[PDB]
Motif scaffolding. Structure first.
Motif, PDB file in Angstrom:
ATOM      1  N   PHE A 165      20.336  30.956   1.272  1.00 17.29           N
ATOM      2  CA  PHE A 165      20.152  31.045   2.717  1.00 17.29           C
ATOM      3  C   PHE A 165      21.433  31.403   3.450  1.00 17.29           C
ATOM      4  O   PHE A 165      21.472  32.327   4.267  1.00 17.29           O
ATOM      5  CB  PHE A 165      19.617  29.723   3.278  1.00 17.29           C
ATOM      6  N   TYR A 166      22.514  30.667   3.191  1.00 12.35           N
ATOM      7  CA  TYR A 166      23.675  30.897   4.050  1.00 12.35           C
ATOM      8  C   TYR A 166      24.605  31.971   3.524  1.00 12.35           C
ATOM      9  O   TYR A 166      25.453  32.475   4.272  1.00 12.35           O
ATOM     10  CB  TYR A 166      24.430  29.576   4.235  1.00 12.35           C
ATOM     11  N   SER A 167      24.484  32.353   2.253  1.00  9.48           N
ATOM     12  CA  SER A 167      25.439  33.345   1.745  1.00  9.48           C
ATOM     13  C   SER A 167      24.888  34.761   1.771  1.00  9.48           C
ATOM     14  O   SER A 167      25.609  35.749   1.616  1.00  9.48           O
ATOM     15  CB  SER A 167      25.871  32.968   0.324  1.00  9.48           C
ATOM     16  N   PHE A 168      23.581  34.911   1.967  1.00  6.90           N
ATOM     17  CA  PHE A 168      23.016  36.257   2.034  1.00  6.90           C
ATOM     18  C   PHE A 168      22.206  36.451   3.301  1.00  6.90           C
ATOM     19  O   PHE A 168      22.414  37.400   4.054  1.00  6.90           O
ATOM     20  CB  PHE A 168      22.178  36.525   0.775  1.00  6.90           C
ATOM     21  N   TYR A 169      21.265  35.554   3.587  1.00  7.75           N
ATOM     22  CA  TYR A 169      20.513  35.753   4.820  1.00  7.75           C
ATOM     23  C   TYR A 169      21.432  35.683   6.035  1.00  7.75           C
ATOM     24  O   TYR A 169      21.369  36.551   6.906  1.00  7.75           O
ATOM     25  CB  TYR A 169      19.394  34.721   4.975  1.00  7.75           C
TER      26      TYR A 169
ATOM     27  N   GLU B  93      23.729  15.063  11.633  1.00  8.10           N
ATOM     28  CA  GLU B  93      24.090  16.057  12.635  1.00  8.10           C
ATOM     29  C   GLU B  93      22.991  17.102  12.807  1.00  8.10           C
ATOM     30  O   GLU B  93      22.536  17.367  13.920  1.00  8.10           O
ATOM     31  CB  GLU B  93      25.389  16.758  12.252  1.00  8.10           C
ATOM     32  N   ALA B  94      22.565  17.695  11.696  1.00  6.27           N
ATOM     33  CA  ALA B  94      21.534  18.721  11.706  1.00  6.27           C
ATOM     34  C   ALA B  94      20.235  18.233  12.337  1.00  6.27           C
ATOM     35  O   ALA B  94      19.423  19.034  12.807  1.00  6.27           O
ATOM     36  CB  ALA B  94      21.249  19.198  10.286  1.00  6.27           C
TER      37      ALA B  94
ATOM     38  N   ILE C 197      20.324  20.612   3.079  1.00  3.06           N
ATOM     39  CA  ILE C 197      19.140  20.151   2.356  1.00  3.06           C
ATOM     40  C   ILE C 197      19.268  20.459   0.869  1.00  3.06           C
ATOM     41  O   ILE C 197      19.014  19.594   0.035  1.00  3.06           O
ATOM     42  CB  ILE C 197      17.847  20.792   2.885  1.00  3.06           C
ATOM     43  N   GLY C 198      19.654  21.692   0.565  1.00  5.17           N
ATOM     44  CA  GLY C 198      19.837  22.128  -0.812  1.00  5.17           C
ATOM     45  C   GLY C 198      20.829  21.223  -1.516  1.00  5.17           C
ATOM     46  O   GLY C 198      20.605  20.788  -2.643  1.00  5.17           O
TER      47      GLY C 198
ATOM     48  N   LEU D  28      23.282  26.767  12.902  1.00 10.07           N
ATOM     49  CA  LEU D  28      22.768  25.405  12.788  1.00 10.07           C
ATOM     50  C   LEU D  28      21.645  25.325  11.764  1.00 10.07           C
ATOM     51  O   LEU D  28      21.650  24.442  10.901  1.00 10.07           O
ATOM     52  CB  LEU D  28      22.307  24.896  14.158  1.00 10.07           C
ATOM     53  N   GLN D  29      20.672  26.234  11.818  1.00 11.25           N
ATOM     54  CA  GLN D  29      19.590  26.137  10.837  1.00 11.25           C
ATOM     55  C   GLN D  29      20.054  26.619   9.472  1.00 11.25           C
ATOM     56  O   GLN D  29      19.422  26.349   8.450  1.00 11.25           O
ATOM     57  CB  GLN D  29      18.349  26.922  11.265  1.00 11.25           C
TER      58      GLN D  29
END
Ligand code: SUF
Ligand code: SUF
Ligand code: MG
Ligand code: MG
Ligand code: MG
Ligand code: MG
Ligand code: MG
Ligand code: MG
Lengths: 336, 336
Positions: free
Chosen positions: A189-193, B122-123, A155-156, A147-148
């Motif tokens: 954020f979502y592809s590495f972290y 949603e977020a 946001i990006g 979710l985060q």
């Protein structure tokens, strides 16, 4: 490795479309197809990065079968998160090709319904999560990590689209501060972290200091990678990128434009101002020229190397006490 | 009551846009606007149905302030869930008006970026959840109630769009079995079960038998309500429905079409076959006539009454041991 993962895709589709109260058969059947057409076809860096990280973070005597099944299940969730972001990303940037085939929204009989499609991909993540990692003490961390992660991406994206309004001469706003934050939220954020983090959590490393450590690296990794996407978007074999670059015509804020705007002469700042952002093939062909006239593709090569080193420096300072070959492996998967 | 809720909207927007790492100022500012333009303007049945249910399910000595703040915060989450489903729903059914103003996607400078917009809505739900109900023992139930609510809606939508493919004579598939399941998933689940359920969970009623009880009622409530939407869509004062009906031209599967197809003569089955689903104002004006020629609006009135009674019968059999005026209150908010 890649081949063992893809083999498991069948098991996940069967978990997701089993449902058929047979009152939703058609909806399920529909769902199945959206998964086949949109989860499959990629490199699988993300899905793979998790399963390879687990093994390297969980002792051999704890890598049981079940713990494995949960390993790649979480692997495929990162896939679906991508499948979701993509399907919606294409409609917005108005794409035609993805993974060397026509965009789902472009397929005859889809169009704007794809939006609900992208939604269903999201719901499948958390549906799997509840279905495998439910009884586990990291379940709420997974969920809260996804979710985060989405919200950061989302946001990006807001930043992106905000910085490239249709038909609006926007060179003013193509600064580097912006480009960095933009990529930090929609890609790093979502592809590495996300992949690594899911691994740690699954392995018991729910630490804060640890997690900030991996983040320090993984984020910087993620910035390079988008930078890579920018380049590939323009200067990359479509037959290897399975998609066409719309960055210029989409008036995006690219590393490129940031790069060219940096070392562009007064006289050269316009050819630019005049041709960027238009849908005109020759207006766009004009842009690509100014890049080539600026030696940019070599300016790219430089960074690709100076970035590599810095990441490596970074890995050599923050990986502890994680197996350094958890980050080292990523930077062999992308820094090529 | 309605006025105390709307008063709190300000507090939620300020929690959501406070964020401004000021590297996302623009994105936040953007977010704020998507909330104002899309959360506000409605009736607020959902958001209200939760706060009114809490009070009636939590002892006066437990309705403390904090427990209150958490009460309507969860109230507004149901709002945002709606705000999200709506913003995306409009683009798909291709709307022009919502809540007596032009659809967000239609606003000059939005278009298809609205998709990311709906996502951000949603977020914001789960962002509030983590921000208020985090330390509470129902937090994971809330989250899992929203995620599975969306997925149910999302499925129902899949059914809808699936049953009304653009430019395709589809009277064959406008059966009642379908219409019921369709509405059960895209409307009944999240607009009636969700609000009540959130209340129960927040009050400590995490029961299974209890929850199936409320569901038994609330679901049947939800079917009527969509049936209401169908009618209002065609036969309702736009100045009171703050939106136009596109059901015919969208070749939707309405109670109406199901109704007319039921008591339509051979000769009358075509005028139908020929005019339904087209974008032609007179082709559509032709449809509306056949309805009126079928006495349907009176056939509606009947059901509205026979349904009311059955729901009441239902409430009078399953509400126990919940305050019957938890369901009784809903059926005064909609059955009018
Ligand atoms: C990866 S995601 C954030 C979408 C993209 O980054 P975009 O922002 O340039 O459309 P792309 O690399 O997939 O083209
Ligand atoms: C409420 S939601 C599921 C959307 C609708 O039900 P639709 O399915 O007819 O577009 P509407 O009542 O908002 O028009
Ligand atoms: Mg994009
Ligand atoms: Mg793109
Ligand atoms: Mg790109
Ligand atoms: Mg609809
Ligand atoms: Mg609609
Ligand atoms: Mg309607």
């Amino acid at each position: 490795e890649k081949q063992d993962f893809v083999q498991h895709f069948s098991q996940i589709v069967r978990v997701l479309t089993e449902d058929e109260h047979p009152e939703i058969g058609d909806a399920i059947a529909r769902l199945k197809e959206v998964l086949e057409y949109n989860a499959i076809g990629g490199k699988y860096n993300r899905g793979l990065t998790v399963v390879v990280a687990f093994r390297e973070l969980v002792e051999p005597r704890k890598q049981d079968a079940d713990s494995l099944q949960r390993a790649w299940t979480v692997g495929w969730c990162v896939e679906l998160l991508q499948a979701f972001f993509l399907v919606a990303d294409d409609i917005m940037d108005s794409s035609l090709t993805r993974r060397g085939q026509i965009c789902w929204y472009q397929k005859p009989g889809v169009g704007l319904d794809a939006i609900n499609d992208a939604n269903l991909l999201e719901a499948c993540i958390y549906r799997l999560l509840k279905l495998y990692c439910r009884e586990q003490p990291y379940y709420l961390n997974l969920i809260e990590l996804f979710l985060q992660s989405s919200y950061q991406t989302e946001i990006g994206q807001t930043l992106d689209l905000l910085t490239a309004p249709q038909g609006n001469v926007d060179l003013v706003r193509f600064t580097e501060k912006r480009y960095k934050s933009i990529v930090k939220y929609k890609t790093a954020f979502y592809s590495f972290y996300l992949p690594i983090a899911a691994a740690m959590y699954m392995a018991g490393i729910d630490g804060e200091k640890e997690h900030a450590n991996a983040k320090k690296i993984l984020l910087e990794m993620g910035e390079f990678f988008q930078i890579q996407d920018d380049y590939l978007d323009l200067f990359g074999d479509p037959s290897v990128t399975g998609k066409i670059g719309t960055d210029i015509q989409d008036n995006k804020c690219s590393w490129l434009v940031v790069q060219c705007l940096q070392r562009a002469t007064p006289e050269q700042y316009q050819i630019l101002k005049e041709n960027y952002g238009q849908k005109e093939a020759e207006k766009v062909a004009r842009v690509k020229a100014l890049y080539e006239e600026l030696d940019l593709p070599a300016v790219f090569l430089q960074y690709e190397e100076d970035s590599y080193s810095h990441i490596m420096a970074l890995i050599e300072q923050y990986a502890a006490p994680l197996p350094p070959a958890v980050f080292l492996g990523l930077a062999r998967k992308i820094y090529k």
